[PDB]
Amino acid sequence: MKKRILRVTFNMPYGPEVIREDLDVRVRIMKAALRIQNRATMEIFGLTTQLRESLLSQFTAWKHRQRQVGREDELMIKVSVEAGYSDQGREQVSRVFVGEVAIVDIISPPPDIGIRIQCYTRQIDRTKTIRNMPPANTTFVKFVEWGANEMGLNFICDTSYNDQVLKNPGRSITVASAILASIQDMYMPDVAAFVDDDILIVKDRDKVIRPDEVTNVNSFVGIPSWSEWGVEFQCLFEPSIRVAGGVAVESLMNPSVNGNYVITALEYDLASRDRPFYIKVMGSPAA
Amino acid sequence: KIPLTAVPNQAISFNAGSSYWKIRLYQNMDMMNADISRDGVIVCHGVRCFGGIPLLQYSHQYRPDYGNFVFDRDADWTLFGDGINLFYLDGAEFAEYQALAT
Amino acid sequence: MNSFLKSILNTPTLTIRDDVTKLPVWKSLQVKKVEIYSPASVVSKPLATKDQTEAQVYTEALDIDVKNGKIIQPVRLRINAICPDLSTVESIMNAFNDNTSTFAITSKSILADKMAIMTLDVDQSPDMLNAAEINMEFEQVEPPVLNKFDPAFPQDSPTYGVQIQSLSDANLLDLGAIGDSISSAAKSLYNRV
Amino acid sequence: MLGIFTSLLSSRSFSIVDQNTNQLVAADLRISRVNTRFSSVGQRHMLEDGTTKMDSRTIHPMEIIVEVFCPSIDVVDQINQLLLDRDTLYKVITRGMVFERMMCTSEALNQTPDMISATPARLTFSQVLVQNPKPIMFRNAGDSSMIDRGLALAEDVVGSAGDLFDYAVNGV
Amino acid sequence: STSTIRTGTNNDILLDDNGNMVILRDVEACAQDVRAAMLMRTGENIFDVNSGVGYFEYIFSPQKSYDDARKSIADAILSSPDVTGIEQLDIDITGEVFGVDAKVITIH
Amino acid sequence: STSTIRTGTNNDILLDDNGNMVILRDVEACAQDVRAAMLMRTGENIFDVNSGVGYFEYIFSPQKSYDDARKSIADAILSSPDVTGIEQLDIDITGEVFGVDAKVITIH
């Protein structure tokens, strides 16, 4: 009888602080192929006075250390989420989200004090500015490369628009976050630009990033159905599912929807002491 | 090929070869028959079905650059999905097909 | 009323077997009742059909669609027993506190496999001055299977290798070296064999 | 229950018959009670003067509860198979009442000191509700309507062009 | 609400002296139509199989319950365009003669 | 709807006077299939563990209850393509023989 695994890590100044699965933790994650950054809402129950003092005081949202030696971690702390199963002590954990805390709350009163937390991916860029002059007259791919270097992310770009000359592409960008909006703006809607985990991905709409890593899916909790753009279904926690990856679908109740699809949006509903432990997938026909 | 099923009268629609087709298959006394559509505009009515000969006979129908359909053996709606198939060939393949035919 | 003359094919003895060990457990119990529940869900909507075609074609329909609408829910099993000693009690409690415990229960002629304890009661009163009454309950973790898949004897396997998840880290333990580079340490570890 | 007066002596009480092959399943069942329940709900609207109007009534599937005794093992696993079946529709004939389109929805065996030889069981059936209860059938396969299958994929995955035709017309 | 052409003891068109087929109004048409329905027998209605009275499966053949014949006859009396419900059904079964009696309620 | 190649009382390929390998149709194919399935013995099939009848662990070994034999045999009779349900299993046990009788239910 396999057990579920859910760890949440915080990179506090003294070191990591990992909330294990033994407590009551609920997490909802939404990811899509857009410029709007990913989000994660976290429910944490049973925190003692010691851990409340240690953690809740560091999501200040004011600024200390006006001299500002360095950047990044001297503004807001980072959170990483990994979920998976465990059988006979043999694990299959996988990472699903990286971000920084933005909003704090208190949800449930005593006797069980619970808090709610909002995290966003690459929110550190909303404060960091641009100190490297954007290219003046260049092609698309070099603009993408400059943006990737400026943000500090490994990038992959594969578009049919890779040999098109742009004039003054980024001469009106004030911070590091509008780079992505610039990249997406030029060639909507065929070109989709998004940031996933730590990788900036720019691609055509209907191209699978990794053609040889197609995950075959044949066991659906949520019956597949046509949904105006392709297919949409639901399953248990499958670590293989990613964004922009491909899926091969074979059904029983709905055998007319079999085919290859490219993943557009995802949703995670993972709990350690509640029923939901799911993944919702929407896809588009492969080109 | 084309997805089919064992029903005495049906119709399947698909987008193949940069073209929109709607085909109808139905039993008429002894042999089968077919209705082929494109653009939503009818092409032919009651095309008798034989094994190995193409469904579209007339030059202005099958291609300036379109394709054509061939049944490997004589159709029988009891056997669809098992031994009897319907295949689609794009323009170049159909051209070399007709070259090989004679 | 002689008992111990149990007829074959229906011997009313409750045998509980650990799923990984496959050895009988809690044979100190004296059970008094067993209940088995096997529910299912059936659609409750008017449903629609074509209903002007050939007879056997319509008989091919009204299947499948009826099949989509009957889905089986887990089996529920209940027993009632008296526990004479102590060791059985703490064994049951320890199995209860574990998240990863499964058992196969055998009634007179009904086999339920891959079960799990969900509810447990204990009662003590002057009606029994040296025993305790128990009320255990199980449900089926997963449904059974007949055939298929590829359980091969040897190393052969369906070779799941789903490991798209990682963040590479370089270690430091190896064997020795304080002021020596990684290449030197690796070469020395190699030459050790 | 009056009605039929047959004078046949050994008639038959409650029996489940398979509606596909006209076959009886679990014919050796000792039946004790049969309960049939009908249910409906009428939607009402609360008017202005002070009255209350009703506009329509909705009918739900009926339910049948049967209490039986199993005198062997074959009856027990026959009942288990009856419950697990997912495709067949069953017709139930009680004393004088005949029902159609039923599937088993429950089964509750029992094991007690009150009975050791047999096994008291309690089943439950529910009706499949369908519009147009009486179908219309044609005896000619060609003489039938047209089903509609919409917008599938050509699915490709085919060997070649010349070789398949040279197999199809040359014969090999 | 119902109308049909007169037939004799045989199921044949009967014409009056002047020779005009008479389109029966209600009531009489209901009785004639029910009588015709009860005699139709299963299986021989093209364009609608599974309609009729199953004589060779439920009555003439050796049976167990005789309930299926009763249900089939009750259905056959129904499905007429104007009939509403059944007041009585008997199924006598004396000797070899299989008696059937009924009294039908109509909207009029 | 299954099919198989006919075999003799010893599991060979049986050849007609014409010498033709024969593809048996349903029912008799089901009988041959179930007869061969009940004779498998467990631990003998490669690629599929836990398939067969535990003769050497449930019947031939000294056993207390003899319901395991019924379960294993009923399962091996199952897993065939067409078997629907099992009607009877008696297990006589007279003298040194282990009498087994079973009647199967088939879609056809």
Cis peptide before A276 (omega within 30 of 0): no
Give the H or E element holding residue F8: none
User: Which member of D25, D74, D81 has the closest CB to residue F89?
Assistant: D74
Nearest CA among D64, D76, D75, D60 for reference residue D123? D64
CA distances from C81 to A180, B59, C1, C30, C127 (A): 67, 86, 20, 5, 14
Burial A229-254 (b: 16+ CB within 10 A, else e): ebbbbebebebbbbbbbbbebebeeb
A193, A140 in Cβ contact below 8 A? no
**3-state percent breakdown (helix, strand, coil) of chain F, nearest 5:** 25, 15, 60
**Chain F residue with minimum CA distance to D20:** F107
Tokens of D117: 């030889």
Identify which of F51, F2, F52, F53 has the alpha carbon closest to the alpha carbon of residue F23.
Answer: F2
Residue E14, token pair as written in the block: 């009967």
According to DSSP H, which parts of C22-177 are helical?
A: 55-60, 87-97
- Three-state SS for B73? coil
Buried b (16+ CB within 10 A) or exposed e, C88-126: bbeebeebeeeeebbbebbbbbbebbbbbbeeeeeeeee
Question: Which residues are registered as beta bridge partners of D112?
Answer: D115
Residue F10 C-alpha, separation from nearest chain C C-alpha, in angstroms: 26
The 3-state DSSP class for residue B95 equals: helix
CA D66, CA D35: separation in Å to the nearest integer? 7
Structure tokens at D89: 């529709």
Among residues 76-105 of chain A, which lie with CB inside 8 Å of chain C?
Answer: 82, 92-95
Instruction: Classify the phi-psi angles of E100: left when phi > 0, otherwise alpha if psi is within -120 to 50, otherwise beta.
Output: beta
Cβ neighbors of C190 (< 8 A, separation 6 or more) are: none
Question: Tokens 């001469």 identify what position?
Answer: A171
Q: What is the DSSP string of E46-84?
A: TT-BS-S--IIIIISS--S--HHHHHHHHHHHS-SSSEE
Q: Give F48-91 as a DSSP string.
A: -TT-S--IIIIISS--SS--HHHHHHHHHHTTSSSEEEEEEE--
Contact between A141 and A203 (Cβ < 8 Å): no
CA-nearest of C189, D128, C40 to C181 is: C189
Please list, in sequence order, all residues whose beta carbon lies within 8 angstroms of the beta carbon of residue C83, skipping any fewer than 6 positions away: C28, C29, C89, C131, C132, C133, C134
A259 part of contact set with chain D, CB < 8 Å? yes
User: What value does the CA radius of gyration of chain F take, rounded to a whole number of Å?
Assistant: 16
Q: Does C150 touch chain F (CB under 8 A)?
A: yes
DSSP string, A69-134: -SSSTTT--EEEEEEEEEETTEE--EEEEEEEEEEE---B-TTS-EEEEEEETTGGGGT-B--SPP
- Between CA A281 and CA A220 the distance in angstroms is 11
The secondary structure of A9-70, three-state, reads: EEEECCEEEEECCCCEEEEEEEEECCCCCCEEEEEEECCCHHHHHHHHCCCCCCCCCCCCCC
Chains B and F touch (3+ CB pairs under 8 A): no
- The neighbour count for residue E10, using CB atoms within 10 Å, is 7
- Closest-CA residue in chain C for F74? C146
> From CA C154, how far away is CA A212, in angstroms rounded?
28
Which chain E residues contact residue D139 at CB under 8 A?
46, 49
Alpha helical stretches, state H, chain B: 59-62, 91-101
The half-sphere exposure of A273 on its side-chain side, counting CA atoms within 13 A, is 10
Nearest to C9 among F49, F75, F91 (CB): F91
Asked if E touches A (at least 3 Cβ pairs < 8 angstroms), the answer reads no
The candidate with the shortest Cα–Cα distance to C80, out of C129, C109, C123, C19, is C123
- Rounded CA-CA distance F102/F108 in Å is 17
Instruction: Write out the E strands in A145-214.
Output: 154-158, 165-167, 191-196, 199-204
Q: What gap in Å lies between CA A177 and CA A184, rounded to an integer? A: 12
- Other beta carbons within 10 angstroms of residue A88's beta carbon come to 9
How many whole angstroms separate alpha carbon F92 and alpha carbon F100? Answer: 7
Please indicate whether, in this complex, the C-beta atoms of A259 and D149 are within 8 angstroms of each other.
no
Phi first, then psi: give them for residue C109, nearest 5 degrees: -140, 10
d(CA C90, CA C94): 6
Q: Which of F48, F57, F79, F80 to mutate to test the interface with C (most CBs of C within 10 A)?
A: F48
Q: Taking CB atoms and an 8 Å cutoff, what residues of chain F touch C11? A: 64-65, 67
> In whole angstroms, what separates CA E16 from the centre of its chain?
25
Shortest CA gap B38–chain D (Å): 14
